[PDB]
Amino acid sequence: YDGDTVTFSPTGRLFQVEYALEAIKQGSVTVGLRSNTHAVLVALKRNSSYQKKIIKCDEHMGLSLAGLAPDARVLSNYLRQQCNYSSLVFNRKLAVERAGHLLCDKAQKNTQSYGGRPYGVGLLIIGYDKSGAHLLEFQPSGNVTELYGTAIGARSQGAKTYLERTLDTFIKIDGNPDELIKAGVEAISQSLRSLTVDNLSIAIVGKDTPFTIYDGEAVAKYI
């Protein structure tokens, strides 16, 4: 039953989509969290140079990937195209929620039509718009969830549990961009079994902060 994406199992499961979800658990952990004012992506790369996990879509939004990078580049290409269309036809900064729903509707098509395969990449999207700071988690099945914080990729459960127990704290971090990054790096550390200036990557966006990425020496002060 698992040889194609258009077949249900006798129990109603879609084995190919579940295998695509298993694909994410192969990639390195990436972490996302936000206060009301700022949203932060903390990614653990892997090497040879480390592959860049973060991708920038706009001054107001960006994302990071776990799993198959080519699926990521396709989805982010489509996302940037949608933002450009929104600015082209309305001069309107595409809302983060609407961008997430566009990704959801694109990813679902591959899980129902024969010939294609589900996108084997999970994405964390952060952005800032009129509604405030946002953090979305996208999955191969097409499901998109808006979260306070999350971690995806191999062994992300530790970071996710840390974020669960720290939620009462980092929600209150308004006007302090550095403390959010500190909390995020502390979270991603729980998923190791170590961080270095060259291995770690960080991104942030918020009320005054446009989407910016820290790599190399720029992340040394946060490690």
């Binding site: 077949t7 249900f8 109603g12 097409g142 969830t145 996710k160 974020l163």
Partner: protein, 232 residues
């Protein structure tokens, strides 16, 4: 076995097994219900909390189509969104051609023809969602429920999902002991909590008198009153 690996194949029993497997997918979904009141419809769904990290409200599940049709579904949520996107396209096309909001029975037929078409070809998968939808039009309140086969009927009250059986058991009591919209919201909350046996209750409704026939979400004091009634 053997006849259920493809969507276009009849079994010797005359049954299409892939649609039955899609139904199996629906029964795994969370409980959602719909209730038709004397002048409107009420929708409710139990939103299971995967973790404390989910934002407490903004993961909305009920969907509006045009302005007078509300949709709620259980099963593969992405397929529900796909079906609702098609419904929105159909309603938009109808309004473009005929300047009038699409009637609920007409919308139900369009969605049923779309869902049934996914059971015709081996190259496409059946929908993994049963969709409760309804609204208010020139002929009053209508409540419908699709099944993955494309089958649908009008209902006095509808329930689907993992707790569909308990929800149905209490919808029977609602119908047998009567239901205005105000009372309908509270009854929907009660039915959802009873079927649940953490989660978030989301309620919506569309009544001729209390919304002017437009679909609105339950929020604030009315939502909390439904919460405490159901807890009561």
């Amino acid at each position: 076995t053997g006849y259920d690996l493809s969507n276009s194949v009849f079994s010797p029993d005359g049954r299409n097994f892939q649609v039955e497997y899609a139904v199996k997918a629906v029964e795994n979904g969370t409980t959602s219900i719909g209730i038709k009141c004397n002048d409107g419809v009420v929708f409710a769904v139990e939103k299971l909390i995967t973790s404390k990290l989910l934002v407490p409200q903004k993961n909305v599940k009920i969907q509006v189509v045009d302005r007078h049709i509300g949709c709620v579904y259980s099963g593969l949520i992405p397929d529900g969104r796909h079906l609702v996107n098609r419904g929105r396209e159909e309603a938009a096309s109808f309004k473009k051609l005929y300047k009038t909001p699409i009637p609920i029975p007409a919308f139900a037929d369009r969605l049923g023809q779309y869902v049934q078409a996914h059971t015709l070809y081996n190259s496409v998968r059946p929908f993994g969602v049963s969709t409760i939808f309804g609204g208010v039009d020139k002929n009053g309140a209508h409540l419908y429920m699709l099944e993955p086969s494309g089958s649908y009927w009008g209902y006095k009250g509808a329930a689907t999902g993992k707790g569909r059986q308990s929800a149905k058991a209490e919808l029977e009591k609602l119908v047998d002991h009567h239901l205005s919209a105000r009372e309908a919201v509270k009854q929907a909350a009660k039915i959802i909590y009873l079927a649940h046996e953490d989660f978030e209750l989301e309620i919506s409704w569309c009544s001729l008198s209390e919304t002017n026939g437009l679909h609105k979400f339950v929020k604030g004091d009315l939502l909390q009153e439904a919460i405490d009634f159901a807890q009561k």
